[PDB]
Amino acid sequence: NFQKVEKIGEGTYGVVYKARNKLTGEVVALKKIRTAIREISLLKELNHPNIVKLLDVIHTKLYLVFEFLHQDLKKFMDASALTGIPLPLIKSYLFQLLQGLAFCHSHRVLHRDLKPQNLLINTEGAIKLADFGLARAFEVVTLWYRAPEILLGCKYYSTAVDIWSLGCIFAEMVTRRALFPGDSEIDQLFRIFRTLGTPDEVVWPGVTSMPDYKPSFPKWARQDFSKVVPPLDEDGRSLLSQMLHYDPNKRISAKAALAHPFFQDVTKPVPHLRL
Ligand SMILES: CCc1cnn2c(NCc3ccc[n+](O)c3)cc(N3CCCC[C@H]3CCO)nc12
Ligand SMILES: O=C(O)c1cc([N+](=O)[O-])ccc1NCCc1c[nH]c2ccccc12
Structure with a gap:
């Protein structure tokens, strides 16, 4: 060979x-x-x-x-778990990932399976999207980053599923704990519901007619983002709330997210990488 x-x-x-x-x-x-x-x-x-x-x-x-990258973000987050990734680096990584998504979405390419292990970093401060779900498109599965419209059986889901996944990753970088760590499709959906409230027609028109929606779903109240990612400042929470909107049509686009005030002071720090 x-x-x-x-x-x-x-x-x-x-x-x-x-x-x-x-x-x-x-x-x-x-x-x-x-x-x-x-x-x-x-x-x-x-x-x-x-x-x-x-x-x-x-x-x-x-x-x-x-191309070969020297670390992945899951290993970097685990290595940073005692102290946390500094906010400027979280912000630089989120901004870069939104740039990558804006680019691939503008070419009508979805990723579909964003997770920390699929985000690759180098010593110079860059982060890159990898492991695009492009084989179906053209050993336990991780559901923690799956958008709710996928879990509810939407056949023709959109670029918004990637913004949802990136929102979950953003939250996890901040809090150092997975936001929605479900171990089955329904457990994943109900973990989302327990945190963001069970969606209804008011916040997500058409949700009750999704293929896998059941009227018998428990109705949980929405808790507040102050509880969900406490350390994050109000700009970060506002952006995160727009990335985790239930309605894929209200969820912020990558291009729109790049203009959010959270990024007014974005910079490109260098990570401390032990290779
Ligand atoms: C695009 C192909 C690729 C290129 N570099 N790289 C890295 N590099 C980081 C790195 C290096 C040496 C040892 N470790 O542990 C991490 C990891 C990685 N992956 C993470 C693990 C699961 C498979 C796979 C998923 C995402 O492509 N895939 C890739
Ligand atoms: O990342 C993977 O593992 C992967 C897997 C398959 N596949 O399984 O068929 C196919 C492509 C893949 N990556 C392409 C990365 C890429 C380069 N230029 C782009 C421009 C827009 C969007 C994406 C890209």
């Missing part, structure tokens, strides 16, 4: 290896997965600083060669 190879983890659609090109010496990441071959390959020339670069596509069964 063309590479020398070491496992780094499991994406949603296949296993990921750190590897060195035998002839070139390039250090890269290889994802092994298992027409569509087409639109994936366009993504080689659609590049953004906050999206992981796809280097090559190879089919026998399907290999994807990516």
Whole structure:
């Protein structure tokens, strides 16, 4: 084979290896997965600083060669759990991720499975989206970041599902605890309901006609964001509240989120990375 190879983890659609090109010496990441071959390959020339670069596509069964990043945000959050990630770095990372989402959404590409392990960081302060759910689009599953319209059975969900996931990640960076740590689809939905209130037609028109909506759902009252992400200042809570709107049509877009006052003082700090 063309590479020398070491496992780094499991994406949603296949296993990921750190590897060195035998002839070139390039250090890269290889994802092994298992027409569509087409639109994936366009993504080689659609590049953004906050999206992981796809280097090559190879089919026998399907290999994807990516640039290599040195840490993922789950490991970085775990490493930072005793002290917390500094607010300026949280804010820089959120801003960068919204830039990546604005870009891919503007090209009508959804991610669909944002989670801390899929967000990759380097020593220079960048963070990049990875592990796009693009294989269906063209070992226990984590539901903690799933938008409620997905859980309620919406077939044709939108770019808003990514804003929801990013909102959950934002909250988790701030509080150092997962916002909605469910272990089943209904447990995930009811954890969301218990925190944000059971949605109704007032806050989410059409929710009661969603495929998996049940009139027998318990009706929980909404608690206040002061309780949900206490340390976060009012600008951060306002932005988070707009990222976690039940109605996908009221939920803030990535482009709109970038203009939120929370980012008026955004900067690009350097993380303390132990590699
Ligand atoms: C795009 C392919 C890729 C490139 N770098 N990289 C990294 N680098 C960080 C890193 C390096 C060395 C050891 N560790 O533990 C982390 C991790 C990672 N992933 C996290 C773990 C689950 C699989 C996979 C998901 C997201 O692609 N995927 C990638
Ligand atoms: O990230 C993955 O694992 C992944 C998986 C599959 N797949 O499984 O078919 C396909 C593509 C993937 N990444 C592409 C990253 C990418 C480069 N330029 C872009 C421009 C817009 C949106 C995204 C990108």
